[PDB]
Amino acid sequence: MGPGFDFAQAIMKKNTVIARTEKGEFTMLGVYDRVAVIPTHASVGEIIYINDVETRVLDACALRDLTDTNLEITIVKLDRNQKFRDIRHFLPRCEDDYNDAVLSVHTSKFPNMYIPVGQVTNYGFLNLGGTPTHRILMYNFPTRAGQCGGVVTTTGKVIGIHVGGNGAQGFAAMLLHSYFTD
Numbered sequence: 001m002g003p004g005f006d007f008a009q010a011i012m013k014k015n016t017v018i019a020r021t022e023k024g025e026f027t028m029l030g031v032y033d034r035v036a037v038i039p040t041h042a043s044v045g046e047i048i049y050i051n052d053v054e055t056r057v058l059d060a061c062a063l064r065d066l067t068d069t070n071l072e073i074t075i076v077k078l079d080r081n082q083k084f085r086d087i088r089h090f091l092p093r094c095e096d097d098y099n100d101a102v103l104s105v106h107t108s109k110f111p112n113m114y115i116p117v118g119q120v121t122n123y124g125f126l127n128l129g130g131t132p133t134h135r136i137l138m139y140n141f142p143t144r145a146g147q148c149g150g151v152v153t154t155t156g157k158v159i160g161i162h163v164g165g166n167g168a169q170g171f172a173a174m175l176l177h178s179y180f181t182d
């Protein structure tokens with residue numbers, strides 16, 4: 001409807017796949033080459049389904065900060081025959097707060113879903129399903145089961161992936177440029 005939805009749509013149409021693990025179907029963001037991200041609670045194994053194609057996982061790393069605290073981001077390298085558009089220049093370098101964010105989801109359950117979530121707070125620490133987690137962004141939207149892995153954008157920036165909610169607020173794990181240097 002406006003430039004926020006325009007940027008979100010551009011990221012969804014070229015830089016997302018549907019990932020299926022034994023824990024469910026997730027929106028998965030492709031970042032560059034064959035490297036993508038997914039919430040760590042997806043429990044990625046040796047094999048994953050990507051748009052219903054059986055795919056070998058070449059590498060998977062559950063990120064933690066230098067306090068050895070969960071970040072809830074898993075980086076996955078896929079044995080896929082095609083590279084993602086390189087979007088690393090849309091990743092923030094530092095932790096920050098944001099205005100006017102969109103949460104975008106694409107699954108069998110929620111195709112072509114875009115949610116204007118509004119103001120995003122650098123929340124920091126969250127006890128996420130019992131697990132101490134750092135670098136959490138918070139927005140005041142009642143997000144639902146099915147939205148995990150959803151991409152959080154502003155105009156010009158890809159800032160996080162949706163990892164949970166409490167019925168009234170939703171929570172994303174930050175994406176930082178430093179996660180994807182090679």
Ligand SMILES: COC(=O)[C@@]1(C)CCCN1S(C)(=O)=O
Nearest residue numbers: 059061075077179180181182
């Ligand atoms: C050279 O360093 C890497 O390989 C990193 C940690 C950088 C981003 C992709 N990965 S990954 C596939 O998750 O291993």
